[PDB]
From a paper:
The end-joining reaction requires the 3′−5′exonuclease activity of E9 that degrades the extremities of dsDNA to create 5′-ssDNA overhangs. The published family B polymerase structures in complex with DNA oligonucleotides, with or without an incoming nucleotide mimicking elongation or editing modes, indicate that considerable domain movements occur upon DNA binding leading to a closure of the structure compared to the apo forms. We performed SAXS experiments using an isomorphous exominus mutant of E9 bound to a 29-mer DNA hairpin to check if the best model would be obtained by adjusting only the position of the thumb domain, or if a movement of each individual domain would be required. Complex formation was confirmed by the decrease of the radius of gyration from 3.83 to 3.45 nm upon DNA binding. The comparison of the SAXS curve of the E9exominus/DNA complex with the calculated scattering of different E9 models showed that when individual domains of E9 are adjusted, the theoretical curve fits better (and the χ2 is lower) than when only the thumb domain is adjusted supporting the generalized domain movements upon DNA binding.
Residue numbers in the entry: -3 to 306, 314 to 900, 904 to 1005
Write the structure that this text describes.
């Protein structure tokens, strides 16, 4: 009877009729659900003069107070005759209007109506409230109307936990050669994972009858499956249900129309749901129909798109019912930089564990994972995925089917269909059920249909596992709070729109309005600066130092904001450059003003100088100052919360403030943005560049002798004369007997790598921690800090994107287990041969020993190691002692989307007693006739690919086609090398071709 007045807001959404409304979906402590409706207004901000003049009066208005309005138009000056920035003060009004309205000179137009709703009425989109029932009037069961939200929502109350309902889903469409088209191909499967308010999971998968034999259908029934003839007969406690395609589609329709909190897919918005919807419209007449919670608006499901070049398109469902249709694909692209956005890749990363072996032999390994085996509850997470997973991937390579599983709350025992190399321990990776679908569909039978069902339910459940892993629920709520937006808009809108809420709040708080009175000219800060290490291979340890949030702190330091910019002073020749510099310094001295040299904006200017006044904190610096403070708060709250549900909330809030802070740099460069400021953006880049160069100049050739650190240049502030002791010789608390020497080896936009002449990681960590302290106390200034992240032993690196090293972190000691770090690569287990592996391992082991001698040019190493290669290469080409085993390579057999490999295995099967069946793992080598000499052309090496079965013996009139293996090997070797012109000569001489260089 009585409504629970204690509610937690969980989404907000709009109808769009001619008679339109805002709706809240909330949840009570019991679990009841309350929809509340609010009238829609369009908000306008006007000056008090405009307000007084208004044609008919506005529906309503509230004063905002006096506010300054500042012209932020950027202008260049060829001298120091720079006019003051236009700035007026007036009383402002927020006005409300039920119909749209053109008001000739209204201000603050860039900000969103919804943002004004929350701000004006004092409502947090993720808040809990004791609603004042006095201000609600019922209109359906469960749906109330609220004319006065400010009063109705007046009692905010602390957050209480709530339960939520989820539908995760996946489909499977038939195909042979082309991508599935709705006009011809039927849906074969629809799988669903339902999570109830209780926490109960319900799995069910609907199989399409019409792609099976009547005999087969009856087999399925006899085996366990429910068969059904209409929607009416569906029983959701049956995990497997056979039915017609139309029934299947009507079931989808019934489920998709329900008001789940979240309907979650992987690429469902562009494919799965689009497919269901069109295939339904085809076979029956029917539409999927969404209604507002008061039944006033009804829309047909219709996928729309949103676009954003820097770049990608995203797809969105138009439901008007409060359900969040959430596509993990789009979200994962937005929120993570990854090599692949395929679901098998994303799952591999997310779900792995360490497997201690319990049995061996037959064709069945066995593993256990638990707290003992890897890390606390990392097995627990793997175990959850195993409930529905049917293929584990051992040690990065060996794909293999599960045979049995035992699962408890903390661990899993799992027996797999693989080969054998039984060490005590191995790495287990999850992901899909890998297959050849196209073949399965070609040979379709009952056992395949059941396999596909197992496959398809797992893809649905992968969405819930990823949703857990990526913490989307709490990120949505955190986003809603921070961005002052509906939960459903958080990951739909782009970064230039989500920043506007907290910006609007700050402008209100600082009683400030920023107005651009002119077309912005075009250009953004483009440049494409990418970063090349001084050398690739490292004999010695490398110390890693990160600036802390460099661009946020740069903006704070410089007070860089479009309205704190006094002007830009440009020059076309050195006479103007010099007069202007000396006038600059008289008229705009430090520390009140900072002056920043920027890449000049026109090809004929030789200098460009931005001058910022630091006396009154600018808008952008203050926004950033807020976001860092908020982040700090939540990081503390995170460490004082102890309930894991709380940990999740504060960890999300913290993360959300990182992200939005880091959005600001790019937004200063983006012309369609409320934070655009060409000068500020450029000045931010430029101040950051200098902080990297300064740190590097000081550390490059620095030495430590006695207790003293001799920095390589004086510790002078690069922007202006400073209070600080610039003396570069500095007392350290280290051992007097230590004597070491430092080299600035690599640095990028916010990071600096320092080589120390030492391999003793224990000492290297001692020293870096001290280097950290002295850098922060003596080298740096104001809000610039570094932290020392890690030591990198055996660094081999090519860029920040492609590198390999043993990482010993700050927490680490000499003798704990490293973290093998690999980045950007593509090899191992039969991309490359044992000959290559053995050669590269020797040429590294010999090259690192050649750098510990210290006796080198770039060339005395380069010549010495290209000599050694020639000899070893000509020797193997002559002696020929290395077994064929050392040149074998592997591959999986499968059907096409690949094309010449079907021809290869076909012709082997067609010509040999044995068959390589369509899921088998076969070996191969590059073999040619023995009367071919050293060949400097190449062909399609493909013609010399030769399957090597157990019988195979190398022809007396055949040779291992050594050239292919050498050319790949010397390619890897010249990219370890630093001298480039030597390397390109060797590679034309030996192989008649030009090498690759991973740039």
């Amino acid at each position: 009877g009585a409504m629970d007045p204690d509610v937690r807001c969980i989404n907000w959404f709009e109808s769009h009729g001619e008679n339109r409304f805002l709706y809240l979906k909330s949840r009570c402590r019991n679990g009841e659900t309350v929809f509340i409706r609010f009238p829609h207004y369009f908000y306008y901000v006007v000056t008090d003069e405009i307000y007084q003049s208004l044609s008919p009066p506005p529906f309503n208005a509230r004063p905002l107070g006096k506010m300054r309005t500042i012209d932020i138009d950027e202008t260049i000056s060829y001298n120091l005759d720079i006019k003051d920035r236009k700035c007026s003060v007036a009383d402002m009004w927020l006005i409300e209007e039920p119909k749209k309205r053109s008001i000739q000179n209204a201000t603050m137009d860039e900000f969103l109506n919804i943002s004004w709703f929350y701000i004006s009425n004092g409502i947090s989109p993720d808040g809990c409230y004791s609603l004042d029932e006095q201000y609600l009037t019922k209109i359906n069961n469960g749906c109330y109307h609220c004319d006065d939200p400010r009063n109705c929502f007046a009692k905010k109350i602390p957050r209480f936990d709530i339960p939520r309902s989820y539908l995760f889903l996946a489909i499977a469409c038939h195909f042979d050669k082309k991508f599935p088209s709705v006009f011809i191909n039927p849906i074969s499967h629809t799988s669903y994972c339902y999570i109830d308010l209780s926490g109960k999971r319900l799995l069910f998968t609907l199989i399409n009858e019409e792609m099976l034999t009547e005999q087969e259908i009856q087999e399925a029934v006899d085996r366990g499956c429910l068969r059904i003839q209409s929607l009416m007969e569906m029983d959701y406690e049956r995990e497997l249900v056979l039915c017609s395609e139309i029934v299947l589609l009507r079931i989808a329709k019934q489920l998709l129309e329900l008001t789940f909190d979240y309907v979650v897919t992987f690429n469902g918005h562009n494919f799965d749901l689009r497919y269901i919807t069109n295939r339904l419209e085809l076979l029956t007449g029917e539409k999927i129909i969404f209604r507002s919670p008061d039944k006033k608006e009804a829309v047909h499901l219709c996928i729309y798109e949103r676009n954003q070049s820097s770049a990608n398109t995203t797809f969105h469902v138009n439901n008007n019912n409060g359900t969040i249709f959430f596509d993990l694909y789009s979200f994962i692209q937005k929120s993570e930089k990854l090599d692949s956005y395929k679901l098998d890749s994303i799952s591999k990363n997310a779900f792995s564990c360490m497997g201690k072996v319990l049995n061996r032999g037959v064709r069945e390994m066995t593993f256990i994972g638990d707290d003992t085996t890897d890390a606390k509850g990392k097995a627990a997470a793997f175990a959850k995925v195993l409930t529905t997973g049917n293929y584990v991937t051992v040690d990065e390579d060996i794909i293999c089917k599960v045979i049995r599983k035992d699962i408890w709350e903390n661990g899993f025992k799992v027996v797999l269909l693989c080969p054998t190399l039984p060490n005590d321990t191995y790495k287990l990776s999850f992901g899909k059920d890998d297959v050849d679908l196209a073949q399965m569909y070609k040979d379709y039978n009952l056992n395949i249909a059941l396999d596909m069902a197992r496959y398809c339910i797992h893809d649905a459940c992968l969405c819930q596992y990823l949703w857990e892993y990526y913490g989307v629920e709490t990120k949505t709520d955190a986003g809603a709070s921070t961005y002052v937006l509906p939960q459903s808009m958080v990951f739909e809108y782009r970064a230039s729109t989500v920043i506007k809420g907290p910006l609007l709040k700050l402008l209100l708080e600082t009683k400030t309005i920023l107005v651009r009175s002119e077309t912005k000219q075009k250009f953004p800060y483009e440049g494409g600066k990418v970063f090349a290490p001084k050398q690739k291979m490292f004999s010695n340890n490398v110390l890693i130092f990160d600036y802390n949030s460099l661009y946020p702190n740069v903006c704070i330091f410089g007070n860089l904001s479009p309205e704190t910019l006094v002007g830009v002073v440009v020059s076309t020749n050195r006479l103007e450059e010099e007069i202007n510099n000396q006038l600059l310094l008289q008229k705009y001295p430090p520390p009140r003003y900072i002056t920043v040299h920027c890449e000049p904006r026109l090809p004929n200017l030789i200098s460009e100088i931005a001058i910022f006044d630091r006396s009154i904190e600018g808008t952008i610096p203050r926004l950033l100052r807020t976001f860092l403070a908020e982040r700090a708060r939540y990081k503390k709250m995170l460490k004082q919360a102890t309930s894991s549900t709380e940990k999740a909330i504060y960890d999300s809030m913290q993360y959300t403030y990182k992200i939005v802070a880091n959005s600001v740099y790019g937004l200063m460069g983006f012309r369609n943005s409320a934070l655009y400021s060409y000068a500020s953006a450029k000045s931010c880049t430029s101040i950051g560049r200098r902080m990297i160069l300064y740190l590097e100049s000081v550390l490059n050739g620095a030495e430590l002798s006695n207790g003293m650190l001799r920095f390589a240049n004086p510790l002078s502030n690069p922007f202006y004369m400073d209070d600080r002791d610039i003396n570069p010789i500095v007392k350290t608390s280290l051992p007097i007997d230590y004597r070491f020497r430092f080299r600035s080896v690599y640095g990028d936009t916010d990071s600096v790598f320092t080589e120390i002449d030492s391999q003793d990681v224990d000492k290297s960590i001692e020293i870096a921690k001290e280097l950290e302290r002295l850098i922060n106390n003596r080298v740096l200034f104001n809000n610039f800090k570094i932290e020392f992240e890690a030591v990198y032993k055996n660094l081999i690196m090519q860029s920040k994107k492609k590198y390999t090293t043993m990482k010993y972190s700050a927490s680490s000691n000499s003798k704990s287990v490293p973290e093998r770090i690999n980045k950007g690569t593509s090899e191992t287990r039969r991309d490359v041969s044992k000959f290559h592996k053995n050669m590269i391992k020797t040429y590294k082991t010999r090259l690192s020993e050649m750098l510990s001698e210290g006796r080198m040019n770039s060339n005395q190493v380069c010549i010495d190691i290209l000599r050694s290669l020639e000899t070893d290469l000509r020797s193997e080409f002559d002696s020929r002692s290395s077994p064929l085993e050392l040149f074998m390579l592997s591959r999986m057999h499968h059907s096409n989307y690949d094309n010449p490999n079907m021809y290869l295995v076909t012709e082997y099967n067609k010509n040999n007693p044995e068959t390589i069946e369509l899921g088998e793992r076969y070996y191969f080598a590059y073999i040619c006739p023995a009367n071919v000499p050293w060949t400097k052309k190449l062909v399609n090496i493909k013609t010399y690919e030769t399957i090597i079965d157990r019988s195979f013996k190398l022809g007396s009139d055949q040779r291992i086609f050594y050239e292919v293996y050498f050319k790949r090997l010397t390619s890897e070797i010249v990219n370890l090398l630093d001298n480039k012109v030597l390397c390109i000569s060797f590679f034309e001489r030996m192989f008649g071709s030009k090498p690759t260089f991973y740039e």
